[PDB]
Scaffold this active site. Structure first.
Site, PDB file in Angstrom:
ATOM      1  N   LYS A 189       0.865  -1.207   0.000  1.00 28.94           N
ATOM      2  CA  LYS A 189       0.000   0.000   0.000  1.00 28.94           C
ATOM      3  C   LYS A 189       0.893   1.246   0.000  1.00 28.94           C
ATOM      4  CE  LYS A 189      -2.973  -3.176   0.255  1.00 28.94           C
ATOM      5  NZ  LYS A 189      -3.103  -3.616  -1.154  1.00 28.94           N
ATOM      6  N   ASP A 190       0.359   2.362  -0.506  1.00 34.28           N
ATOM      7  CA  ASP A 190       1.030   3.689  -0.580  1.00 34.28           C
ATOM      8  C   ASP A 190       1.564   4.058   0.812  1.00 34.28           C
ATOM      9  OD1 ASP A 190      -0.853   3.362  -2.865  1.00 34.28           O
ATOM     10  OD2 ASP A 190      -0.227   5.403  -3.410  1.00 34.28           O
ATOM     11  N   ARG A 191       2.796   4.570   0.886  1.00 35.69           N
ATOM     12  CA  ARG A 191       3.462   4.984   2.154  1.00 35.69           C
ATOM     13  C   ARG A 191       2.866   6.317   2.616  1.00 35.69           C
ATOM     14  NH1 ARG A 191       7.046   8.617   2.955  1.00 35.69           N
ATOM     15  NH2 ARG A 191       7.726   8.675   0.773  1.00 35.69           N
TER      16      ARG A 191
END
Length: 583
Positions: free
Chosen positions: A214-216
């Site tokens: 998932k996106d940081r």
């Protein structure tokens, strides 16, 4: 600095429609990414694990103490293995052995390598429960009960982990090979967050597994399996964990694997919104823009993420590697202070000594600069072949480059109308199929069914000759042939995957709300919603605002377009927002 146009991204699906300027990922709570499991349910964090009792009842103990007695006496040895065991010891010792199994006592015994352990078999197997001792004082087997006095296995003193209702693991099921759980993280990579867990548990990284990263620069929820660990310790992490919370425990026999998800649900706060277009409303722009996203879709372009840091674009390097132009490939990879030395001199060894992929230079620091001070083509090859992680990543950038380029022409030529001799996939490797003039009329397949292939050796190209002609043309420009696409190295060019040309987001819901500071948050995390709901029992609710996902519209100068949607696993969220906004 490399632009969108410089990596194949040229076109929009519905360019007729007005867009709007905006800024995304301003705060971490302006980008929610919630995983969608294999079934279609969105993953949310609904608890912070459980609460450990400090006392590991008295009626629970004497219940399972009396429960043990019952089976011990009720259990009888197989008559065949009994009257055999009599022959070895004698009818008196068999009764001493039978008596220790029932009670907590030791039997004395009174008596050869060959049949020293043939007795150890007919004990273990016949009684099922285990034996204490091997041959001890003299040549007699002084064997009391199995490990435990008060329980069966000792492995079955799991009974220390009992719930109020008398359930094995603090209300969770029997133990299993894997504990699945939900991982709520803020400004951490999936890989980073899970490898924190393993580090804190003193376990190798291979126990923990996830479905997708998932996106940081975001708050995200996803499911994570882990083996060789018990709830009690995993649950204890939440006390010491920094910017992430673990919850929603479930035992299962399955571990998670890359691909164990359908897609992801996004909630994107677009901040500081300006329309430019002074003829139609924002509500009007967005409404028609989203209508087009849901109806028409967006071009499933590869985002910048697959072309790297805005410098020497990775695809132009990839091209050279595929063409087996090794000197050119290296020279491009070399284009802070080290690259100034290399361009000024040409000494690999001198250039090496400047950093406390470029580390090419170690390889070329060995070998020999020939005459002319020119490194040999065969020397550059040797140097290129020193990690496959990056080597492949380059050639993949060329494939993605060619794809984006073509996918643009596919739309440019025909558009969202499905042309004959296109490519689709049928639900029966992932095998393609050329579309007939018939199945167009059958409207069996729509635009969202249409795929194009990555240039490769094991991949059918479009039947439609005017589309087939793109591949040959686009690749001819860069001196390659789509049909002779196999190579001699691990730069094998890949088979070349299939990829859908357009993508329509699911459950697309927009919402316009006006704010003041960039600081203030207009969207609540799952954790925010949890803590204020979990404290409806307690009573001290922050506000009714933080039970809903969205904060209510206060009013102000600034305008935010917060919108929520789900994408496939193949689609870049950026390439979705691009179609809407026209940036």
């Amino acid at each position: 600095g490399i632009h969108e146009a410089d990596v194949g991204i040229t076109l929009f699906l519905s360019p007729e429609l007005p867009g709007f300027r905006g800024q995304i990922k301003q705060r971490y709570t302006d980008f929610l990414v919630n995983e969608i499991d294999q079934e279609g349910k969105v993953i949310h964090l609904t608890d912070k694990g459980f609460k450990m009792p400090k006392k590991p009842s008295k009626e629970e103990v004497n219940a399972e103490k009396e429960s043990e007695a019952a089976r011990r006496q009720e259990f009888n040895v197989d008559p065949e293995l009994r009257n055999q065991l009599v022959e070895i010891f004698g009818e008196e010792d068999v009764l001493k052995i039978e008596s220790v199994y029932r009670t907590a006592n030791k039997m004395e015994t009174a008596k050869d390598k060959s049949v020293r352990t043939k007795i150890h078999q007919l004990l273990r197997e016949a009684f099922k429960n285990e034996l204490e001792s091997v041959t001890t004082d003299t040549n007699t087997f002084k064997i009391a009960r199995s490990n435990r006095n008060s329980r069966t296995n000792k492995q079955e003193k799991i009974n220390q982990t009992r719930d109020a209702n008398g359930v094995e693991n603090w209300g969770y099921g029997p133990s299993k090979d894997f504990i699945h759980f939900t991982l709520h993280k803020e400004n951490k990579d999936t890989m980073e967050a899970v490898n924190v867990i393993t580090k804190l548990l003193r376990v190798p990284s291979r126990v923990i597994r996830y479905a997708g990263t998932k996106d940081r620069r975001a708050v995200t929820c996803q499911r994570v399996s882990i083996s060789k660990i018990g709830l009690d310790r995993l649950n204890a992490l939440n006390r010491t964990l920094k910017g992430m919370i673990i919850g929603n425990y479930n035992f299962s026999d399955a571990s998670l694997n890359l691909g164990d998800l359908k897609g992801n649900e996004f909630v994107v706060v677009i901040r500081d919104v300006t329309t430019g277009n002074s003829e139609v409303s924002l509500e009007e722009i967005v409404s028609n823009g989203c209508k087009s996203l849901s109806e028409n879709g967006f071009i499933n372009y590869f985002g910048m993420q697959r072309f790297g840091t805005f410098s020497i674009s990775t695809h132009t390097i990839g091209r050279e590697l595929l063409l087996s132009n090794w000197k050119k490939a290296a020279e491009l990879i070399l284009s802070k202070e080290a690259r100034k030395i290399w361009a000024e001199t040409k000494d690999a060894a001198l250039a090496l000594k400047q950093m406390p992929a470029e580390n090419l230079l170690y390889s070329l620091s060995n070998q020999r600069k020939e005459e002319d001070g020119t490194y040999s083509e065969n020397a550059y090859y040797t140097a290129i072949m020193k990690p496959r992680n990056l080597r492949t990543m380059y050639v993949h950038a060329y494939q993605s480059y060619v794809w984006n380029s073509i996918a643009s022409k596919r739309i440019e030529l025909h558009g969202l109308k499905l042309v004959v001799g296109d490519l689709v996939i049928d639900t029966s490797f992932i095998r393609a199929k050329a579309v007939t003039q018939e199945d167009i009329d059958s409207v069996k397949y729509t635009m969202e069914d249409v795929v194009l292939p990555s240039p490769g050796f094991d991949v059918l190209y479009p039947s439609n000759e005017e589309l087939k002609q793109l591949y040959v043309d686009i690749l001819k420009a860069d001196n390659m042939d789509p049909f002779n696409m196999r190579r001699k190295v691990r730069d094998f060019s890949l088979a070349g995957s299939y990829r859908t040309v357009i993508q329509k987001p699911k459950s697309l819901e927009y919402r316009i709300i006006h704010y003041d500071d960039p600081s203030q948050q207009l969207v609540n995390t799952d954790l925010d919603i949890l803590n204020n709901t979990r404290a409806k029992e307690s009573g001290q609710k922050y506000m009714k605002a933080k039970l809903d996902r969205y904060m209510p519209d206060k009013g102000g100068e600034k305008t935010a377009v917060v919108l929520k949607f789900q994408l496939g696993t193949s689609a870049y969220a950026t390439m979705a927002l691009r179609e809407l906004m026209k940036l």
